[PDB]
């Protein structure tokens, strides 16, 4: 939490038509910086100049007059921050929730269960089956699919202020990646206290992204649509992006090998509801621009801010989409034929 004199990392050859205009601005462009700073050495009385590469998201400008290009980490503004220990891992392991003796868990084995009310087929267990603690948004990853068919659940669908929880029957592979070979450096500040920072970009400046099959996504989009259309009086249902909120809410968030992602789900929700297939053309992958950030605070206020140390070298993980979290726009509209 000190001053950072940051500069963008490498020049480029951006040209072509037109030319008369001058300054461009785009909110969707994942980019790194080359921040420089002084930090304390082994002894309090001395300090040295280090440089690190920080995601633009993780830094914020400060208006100093004595110098230019001055930034600070977003947290020095609000909360303390610690770095995830190298030894520990936030890999979602299946954990079993078990009841004490004299207690018991009851498992509903109904294949077309609604969430509430009677269960015809029940079975007692002492422990819950393996449940991986996956933290994601919009898309429910690596979860349990529905046995019967894809399911929609809500405390009451009519109350637009309560989340729709979709459960797919067949999973949809999603393969996300940070393709750049990022070298990392250890920066020490005493006594032996050190933090890993990204050092260099070996090779091309590549951009983070996710991949879903267009044929396989658009299908479940349809299959979900058909199940939704059944609930809202055969009204033709349509999908769109998030109306606002924190990035984590207006994007698909998760972590691969520890780095935390924020993928633009705009592409997944353009709509494309009418199925013609176009002679099975215009259908390969559907790629989403992903943004990556290191200083991160979950659970809002409860808990401190975390700095995710970079994993050296390019990374890529594949999860299976097993469900979704949706919310309906609700107001008076065209009674016939509105939707």
């Amino acid at each position, epitope marked *: 939490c000190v001053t950072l004199i940051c500069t963008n990392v490498t020049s*480029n050859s951006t040209n072509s038509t037109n030319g008369v205009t001058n300054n461009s601005t785009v909110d969707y462009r994942e980019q790194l910086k080359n921040c420089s700073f002084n930090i304390t050495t082994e002894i309090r009385d001395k300090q040295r100049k280090e440089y690190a590469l920080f995601y633009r998201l993780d830094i914020v400008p400060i208006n100093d007059n004595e110098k230019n290009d001055t930034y600070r980490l977003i947290n020095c503004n609000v909360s303390t921050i610690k770095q995830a220990c190298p030894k520990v891992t936030f890999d979602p392991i299946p954990i079993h929730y078990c009841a004490p003796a004299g207690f018991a868990i009851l498992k509903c084995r109904d294949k077309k269960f609604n969430g509430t009310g009677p269960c015809k087929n029940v079975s007692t267990v002492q422990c819950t089956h393996g449940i991986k603690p996956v933290i994601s948004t919009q898309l429910l990853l690596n979860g349990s699919l529905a046995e019967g068919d894809i399911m929609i659940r809500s405390e009451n669908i009519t109350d637009n202020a309560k989340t729709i929880i979709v459960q797919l029957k067949t999973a949809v592979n999603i393969t996300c990646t940070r393709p750049s070979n990022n070298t990392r450096k250890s920066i020490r500040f005493g006594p032996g206290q050190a933090f890993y920072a990204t050092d260099e970009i*070996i*090779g*091309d400046i*590549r951009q983070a992204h996710c991949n879903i099959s267009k044929t396989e996504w658009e299908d479940m989009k349809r299959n979900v649509s058909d199940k939704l259309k059944a609930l809202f009086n055969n009204k033709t249902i349509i999908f769109k992006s998030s109306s606002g909120g924190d990035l984590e809410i207006t994007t698909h968030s998760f972590n691969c090998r520890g780095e935390f992602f924020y993928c633009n789900t705009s592409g997944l929700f353009n709509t494309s509801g009418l199925f013609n297939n176009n002679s099975n053309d215009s259908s390969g992958n559907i790629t989403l621009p992903c943004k990556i950030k290191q200083i991160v605070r979950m659970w809002q206020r409860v808990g401190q801010a975390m700095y995710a140390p970079p994993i050296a070298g390019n990374i890529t993980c594949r999860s299976r989409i097993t469900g979704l979290l949706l919310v309906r726009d609700g107001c008076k509209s065209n009674e016939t034929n509105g939707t």
Partner: antibody
Amino acid sequence: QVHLQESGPGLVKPSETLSLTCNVSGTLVRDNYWSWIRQPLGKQPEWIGYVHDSGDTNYNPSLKSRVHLSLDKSKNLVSLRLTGVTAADSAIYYCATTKHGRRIYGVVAFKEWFTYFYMDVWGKGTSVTVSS
Amino acid sequence: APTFVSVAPGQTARITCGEESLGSRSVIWYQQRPGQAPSLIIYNNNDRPSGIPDRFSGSPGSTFGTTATLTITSVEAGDEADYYCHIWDSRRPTNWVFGEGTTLIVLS
């Protein structure tokens, strides 16, 4: 046997615009991307700029201000104009068909690629001297 | 700058140009002789136009922190020339002059 060559004045004095011309044959002038190259005595070749019809042109930043390229259709030939010359500009010049392409290394969608230019056939070379 | 290398007639010569790569490059190689203008030998690192043999090998654009080495197997006498090259890198702005060419020679 597609071949070409240029035609210049030989000598120009300072503070004068150096005009040059690259007469061509074998193929059309519309059907090609066109370049200009100069190489002094015992030095490496310097890429001047390149041009194509439909209002497309790009220059070397060193002399993006001074050079003014042109293009004649019917005559099948190219042109050049370099203002405010000095002894620095004196070099042997050339003109060549600039065959271009695209180098892709990542996601095309995100513009993770770049376009490059090679020149497969050269002229003879117009020797240009700049002295008072 | 150093631009010379000695190789016997029948052996192989490897000549280098430009700074080490940062990203994927599209390295174009040329060859010039006295009087004549520079001629194209290789484009896109290892692709060659009409009239150039297979002996002319080139560094792949795929490598990083690496100098561009033009390798010519079984060096011919009439191949002694200036080899100015033109580098197109992903991570550096368009170069508008060519690189220094390791001039080629033969022992005997």
